[PDB]
Amino acid sequence: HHMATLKRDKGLDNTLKVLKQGYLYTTNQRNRLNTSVFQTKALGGKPFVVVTGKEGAEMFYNNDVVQREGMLPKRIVNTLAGKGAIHTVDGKKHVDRKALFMSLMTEGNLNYVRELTRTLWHANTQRMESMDEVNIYRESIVLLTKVGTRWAGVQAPPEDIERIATDMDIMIDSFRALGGAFKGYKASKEARRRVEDWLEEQIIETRKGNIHPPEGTALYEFAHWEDYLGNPMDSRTCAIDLMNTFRPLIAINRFVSFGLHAMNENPITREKIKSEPDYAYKFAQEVRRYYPFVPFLPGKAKVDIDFQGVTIPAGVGLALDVYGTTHDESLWDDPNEFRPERFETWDGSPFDLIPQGGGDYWTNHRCAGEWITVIIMEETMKYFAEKITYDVPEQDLEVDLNSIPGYVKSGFVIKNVREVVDRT
Numbered sequence: 001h002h003m004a005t006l007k008r009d010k011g012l013d014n015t016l017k018v019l020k021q022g023y024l025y026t027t028n029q030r031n032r033l034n035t036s037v038f039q040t041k042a043l044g045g046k047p048f049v050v051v052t053g054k055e056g057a058e059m060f061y062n063n064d065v066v067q068r069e070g071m072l073p074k075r076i077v078n079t080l081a082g083k084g085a086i087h088t089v090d091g092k093k094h095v096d097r098k099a100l101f102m103s104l105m106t107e108g109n110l111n112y113v114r115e116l117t118r119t120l121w122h123a124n125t126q127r128m129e130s131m132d133e134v135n136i137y138r139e140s141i142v143l144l145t146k147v148g149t150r151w152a153g154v155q156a157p158p159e160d161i162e163r164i165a166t167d168m169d170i171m172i173d174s175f176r177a178l179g180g181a182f183k184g185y186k187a188s189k190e191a192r193r194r195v196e197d198w199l200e201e202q203i204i205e206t207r208k209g210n211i212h213p214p215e216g217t218a219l220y221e222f223a224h225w226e227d228y229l230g231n232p233m234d235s236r237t238c239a240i241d242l243m244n245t246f247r248p249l250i251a252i253n254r255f256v257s258f259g260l261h262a263m264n265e266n267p268i269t270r271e272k273i274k275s276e277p278d279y280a281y282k283f284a285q286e287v288r289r290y291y292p293f294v295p296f297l298p299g300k301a302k303v304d305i306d307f308q309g310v311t312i313p314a315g316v317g318l319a320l321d322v323y324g325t326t327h328d329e330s331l332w333d334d335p336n337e338f339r340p341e342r343f344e345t346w347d348g349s350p351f352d353l354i355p356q357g358g359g360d361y362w363t364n365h366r367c368a369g370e371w372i373t374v375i376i377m378e379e380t381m382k383y384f385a386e387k388i389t390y391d392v393p394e395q396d397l398e399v400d401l402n403s404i405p406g407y408v409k410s411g412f413v414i415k416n417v418r419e420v421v422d423r424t
């Protein structure tokens, strides 16, 4: 019957086309097919209906019609999320375990991550002054490894931090093939196993009473948690989900690199981060909206869904267009311009600013760490804008929108770092 016909990016499998157009694939198809919703096949002939905008996001997060079970590509589960991770469960089991993740996001725990971040950048100033150049992508990922492990209650000796950061970096990057085979797949599984082994030891030692992580940290709460049926997570699964509490915190290094990129590109933002109290928040929010990170999210239609003039058939894949929604003309005035001032009148909808998911924290798969992400970016941008001066030598600053994942090609390099001190 009874709806209009669902247009298609025709082909048995368009994975290579998706990979070559990257974050602009869905926009290109919508413009080429002149439509707001279309079907494409990928990952070996699997049909996906691409939905976007607020309506797309509110439908994608309707648990009565959309299923997330088994839709993350297996290789991404094996490298990025981990087997049996929170991302891979649905229903009461998911709601129960998600409440554990959300219980970490207290006012005091959020204030703690803010202070850790501020202290570590302040302490890092001398080191960056001594370096001839500083790759911000790499320097922030090492610093955030120190922040994240400590916030999670996980003991990481300083001699192991560079190793851990590198292993996290590999796992975070491992969605690049969208679940297809790729050269660094085994290196990614090996990195994950090293980190999993390390965390599982900490959980076991916590449960044995050999170490005593502080109450309220991820290590403590996860090791002692029981699900709604009375059963604790087995040690390996516990280690996996414990990693889910701070690996993505370490992934904030992507947004730190982007934030300095934005500051360099919009020079006046530096002064306003210094002088306007709310501005650091708005700049952080506009970095998350504007720069590419998560391209889209996979789901599956549980039943026929009537959506934007078409019928989405039961059993077809669904792809929530993350990049397309955060750059949706009709949601954001001049969406391809960096404009932190737009967040002066953003009404806080759960369904437009979705760079880390949409919907409800407690009953949807929406990112648990959005507050931490904003807090860490606020403090990091405040540091770079206010506590130090530096030079940006010319280098490859391109963010290739046709290449997933989004990166500044150089990683954003700075030189001539010097503390700002009033010694008068």
Ligand code: HEM
Pocket (backbone or CB within 6 Å): 086, 087, 088, 098, 101, 244, 245, 246, 248, 249, 250, 251, 252, 253, 255, 293, 294, 297, 355, 356, 357, 358, 364, 365, 366, 367, 368, 369, 370, 372, 373
């Ligand atoms: C650094 C940038 C970050 C990005 C781009 C990001 C993005 C995402 C996305 C797209 C999802 C999936 C949403 C869905 O499936 O509907 C997700 C889930 C999740 N994120 Fe993040 N996130 C980030 C930071 C964080 C941080 C800092 C934490 C923890 C402190 C975190 C913890 C999680 C968890 C636990 C989930 C799974 C929740 C569930 O399945 O119910 N993330 N994130």
Ligand SMILES: CCCCCCCCCCCCCCCCCCCC(=O)O
Pocket (backbone or CB within 6 Å): 018, 040, 042, 043, 048, 050, 072, 073, 080, 171, 172, 175, 178, 179, 247, 248, 251, 293, 294, 295, 296, 297, 298, 319
């Ligand atoms: C056109 C649609 C094609 C459909 C293919 C669906 C393939 C799904 C790819 C999903 C990519 C997930 C990216 C998640 C990034 C996670 C944020 C980093 C934080 C972390 O370490 O967890």
